[PDB]
Structures are given as structure tokens and as C-alpha cells.
Ligand SMILES: O=C(N[C@H](CO)[C@H](O)c1ccc([N+](=O)[O-])cc1)C(Cl)Cl
């Protein structure tokens with residue numbers, strides 16, 4: 001059914017990907033420095049500051065997006081901006097794209113570790129990363145757009 005492929009993100013993908021977050025909570029989980037409503041400009045700003053922006057495609061549709069927000073050659077990468085089209089949630093897109101990013105971190109950055117940080121309210125993410133072999137290492141305090149304290153669960157996984 002799901003026949004996923006991947007390639008580097010392109011300008012022509014921005015409007016699609018900027019359509020993915022469906023509410024302020026979803027935007028905060030995947031891009032906590034963004035301001036609702038999301039926009040192509042905000043997405044392009046991230047892409048410029050980051051590395052490895054990659055889309056996942058199925059049946060001619062861009063269904064996922066991810067990048068690295070930290071990269072340290074021979075050391076680790078940290079995954080962020082993981083977004084999935086609302087019509088394709090729970091179909092394997094995030095897990096597919098995390099595997100692609102793991103490979104890119106190993107191959108291009110010679111990373112030994114991938115870091116993922118997940119906000120506490122994002123249960124789906126915490127469970128998914130757990131299923132993929134990520135372990136929690138620390139919890140950091142952050143604040144949401146209403147000034148409320150949230151917990152950022154910092155996880156990692158050795159790259160094999
Ligand atoms: O789907 C969710 N989380 C996934 C888990 O991998 C991920 O964190 C995510 C976050 C934002 C998003 N988006 O805004 O399009 C999509 C997936 C929760 Cl919003 Cl239920």
C-alpha cells in the first residue's frame with residue numbers, strides 16, 4: 001500500500017509542507033519557535049538555518065518533512081521539524097522518514113548518535129520514538145506560547 005520514497009525538499013514543496021500543522025499544539029511540537037499561523041516564510045527560515053531538509057513522497061504526494069537542527073560531524077545529529085500530512089497520519093510516514101534521517105546522519109555526518117527532543121504533550125511522538133529504539137536521557141523546562149511550563153523530553157539512539 002504505502003510505497004514511500006524520499007528526496008531533498010524543494011521550493012515547490014514549501015506550501016504543501018506549511019499546510020501540515022493543523023493547530024497551535026501541532027506547530028509547537030514540530031517547530032516551537034514558530035508563531036501561529038504557520039507560513040512558507042517561517043518554514044523557509046528554518047530550512048535556511050538547518051541541514052538535511054527531506055520530504056517523503058507517496059503516490060505523488062509530499063506526506064512528510066524532516067531536517068536536522070543540530071549536526072556535529074563524527075558525533076551526532078538532532079532531528080527536528082518532523083511534520084506529516086494530516087491525511088497521512090499513522091501510516092508509517094514518520095517512521096520511514098526517521099529511518100531515512102538516521103541513514104543520512106550516519107552516512108553524511110558520520111554520526112554515532114541521533115538526538116530527538118519531544119514535548120511532553122506529544123504522546124504519539126514519545127511512543128513512536130520509543131518503538132524506534134530511542135531512550136529518554138533528560139528532561140528540560142520550556143515554555144509554550146501562553147507562557148505555561150512544559151517538559152521537553154530529550155531522547156537519543158546509537159546509530160548502527
Ligand atoms: O502526530 C503527532 N505527533 C507526531 C509523532 O511522530 C509528530 O510529533 C508530528 C508533529 C507535528 C506534525 N504536524 O504538525 O504536521 C506532524 C507530526 C501528534 Cl500531533 Cl498526535
Ligand SMILES: O=C(N[C@H](CO)[C@H](O)c1ccc([N+](=O)[O-])cc1)C(Cl)Cl
Nearest residue numbers: 040041042043044045046047048049
Ligand atoms: O532571506 C532570504 N533567503 C534565505 C537564504 O538566503 C532563506 O531562504 C530565508 C527565507 C525566508 C526567510 N524568512 O522570511 O523568514 C528567512 C530565510 C530571502 Cl528573503 Cl532573500
